[PDB]
């Protein structure tokens, strides 16, 4: 089922800035008109987030360079899709991802999210093969070009698919004390440039008691067979720009502001800069003229 779509020279930086994102509800308790300070894993404000494209259409006639490397987990990942043709269909997690330990698999098909924290190997380029079914864009079915085994399979889960203008999606992955929680948020953005000049909350969706070890992860991409070449050398596919982001979470304290409706309107980091830190120690989003003392929060 697997192929070898790997022949290129990687561009190491491939990153941009994330202005104000990654804030998610840390608990299941409703609050309103109150500012709460929550010490938890979070993405930094104005952080550096990877900007992998994975589809570099450039040149006189263009090309379909493929790039979905494996990324370290580092005790938390923030992910976004901002797709237009619904071509990102889940993720892969594990320690070494080759018949050693349990590995988590996520696939988002039409009406079934497939979860498999089970022991099986992943090739160097796991992906998904999808076709439009006569261009009707209704059946839109996929393929298992992701793995080749299901040995010693432990956990499974199925429910309504996570996937339902640019359609900016945001996900937060956190493997803490044996509980894997996937938070999510759907937001449309008109601008086709990088992340918007705005803020939005990020709700939880489902918690998984996988209880495994995760150190590296990879993204799954749905690809369409543009042409079938005779003597198949893993012919190039087409999905379109495969534009996804990656963020890294760290343990810090944020101040979360709730409105009357209970939705988060804005948040301020306690380590971004002294001004934002001064807001935390005062537990207020407005700081009057004067001089204030602040407590250390660095690692």
């Amino acid at each position: 089922q697997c192929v070898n779509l790997t022949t290129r020279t990687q561009l190491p930086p491939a990153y941009t800035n994330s202005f104000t994102r990654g804030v998610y509800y840390p608990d299941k308790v409703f609050r309103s008109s109150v500012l709460h300070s929550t010490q938890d894993l979070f993405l930094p404000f104005f952080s550096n987030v990877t900007w992998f494209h994975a589809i570099h259409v450039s040149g006189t006639n263009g090309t379909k360079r493929f790039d979905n490397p494996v990324l370290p987990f580092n005790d938390g990942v923030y992910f976004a899709s901002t797709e237009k043709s619904n071509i990102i269909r889940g993720w892969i997690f594990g320690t070494t991802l080759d018949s050693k330990t349990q590995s988590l698999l996520i696939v988002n098909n039409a009406t079934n999210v497939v979860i498999k924290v089970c022991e099986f190997q992943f090739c160097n380029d796991p992906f998904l093969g999808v076709y439009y079914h006569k261009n009707n864009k209704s059946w839109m079915e996929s393929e298992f070009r992701v793995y080749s085994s299901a040995n010693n399979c432990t956990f499974e889960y199925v429910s309504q698919p996570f996937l339902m203008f640019k359609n900016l999606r945001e996900f937060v992955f956190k493997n803490i004390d044996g509980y894997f929680k996937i938070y999510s948020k759907h937001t449309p953005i008109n601008l086709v440039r990088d992340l918007p000049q705005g803020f939005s909350a990020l709700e939880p969706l489902v918690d998984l008691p996988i209880g495994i070890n995760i150190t590296r992860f990879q993204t799954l991409l749905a690809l369409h067979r543009s042409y079938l070449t005779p003597g198949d050398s893993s012919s190039g596919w087409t999905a379109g720009a495969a534009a996804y982001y990656v963020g890294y979470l760290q343990p810090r304290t944020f101040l979360l502001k709730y409105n009357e409706n209970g939705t988060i309107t804005d948040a301020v980091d306690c380590a971004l800069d002294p001004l934002s830190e001064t807001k935390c120690t005062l537990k207020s989003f407005t700081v009057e003229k004067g001089i204030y003392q602040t407590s250390n929060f660095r690692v």
Partner: antibody
Amino acid sequence: QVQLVQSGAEVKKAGSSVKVSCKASGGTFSSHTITWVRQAPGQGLEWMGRIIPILGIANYAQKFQGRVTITADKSTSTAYMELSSLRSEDTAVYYCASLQTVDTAIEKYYGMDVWGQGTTVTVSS
Amino acid sequence: YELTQPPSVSVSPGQTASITCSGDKLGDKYACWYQQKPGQSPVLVIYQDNKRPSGIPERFSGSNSGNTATLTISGTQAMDEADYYCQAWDSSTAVFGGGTKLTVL
């Protein structure tokens, strides 16, 4: 890429067990459902069934109910079948083709991308 | 589920040929058409709805109507001699029709 090269024409007596197979020699044996269609002179095409190697689920046709025993093993990377109770009228040319998918409801997503050269069978009586 | 088509069709070269593959509830069933030449194995020219796989010249086209499937031929040549079989994957099974033989003067 699958060539689906198979054996040439064979001569055998009537009422004997018939064994025919196609060997790929090209792409991976799995990841490509293998189906067979019978070609006869002035009778159109006849579909009997298909087998998915990796899934191992085989579907039969209405007229070929119980007269075929389809098996496929990944270790041998070859698909072979046992045919019996064959009459002279049933004699025809058998073909084998791939379908690019290995799932039951997904064979609708493709046509028969590659065919075989055709292995004619003659019945002697 | 049952396929019946004319035994044969004849048309002058360079003309537009229309072939009808009638049946029972074949519209909204996503029929597919195949091609077979004398002395050569069958090849895929129309896949999943009048769709032409890569490597095939832009000569075969058509549309699927409410209860009929039609194939239009453009730029007919001498080497177009072949037999067309229209089939569909119905009820987890494939049904093959009698087929039509194209004749060119």
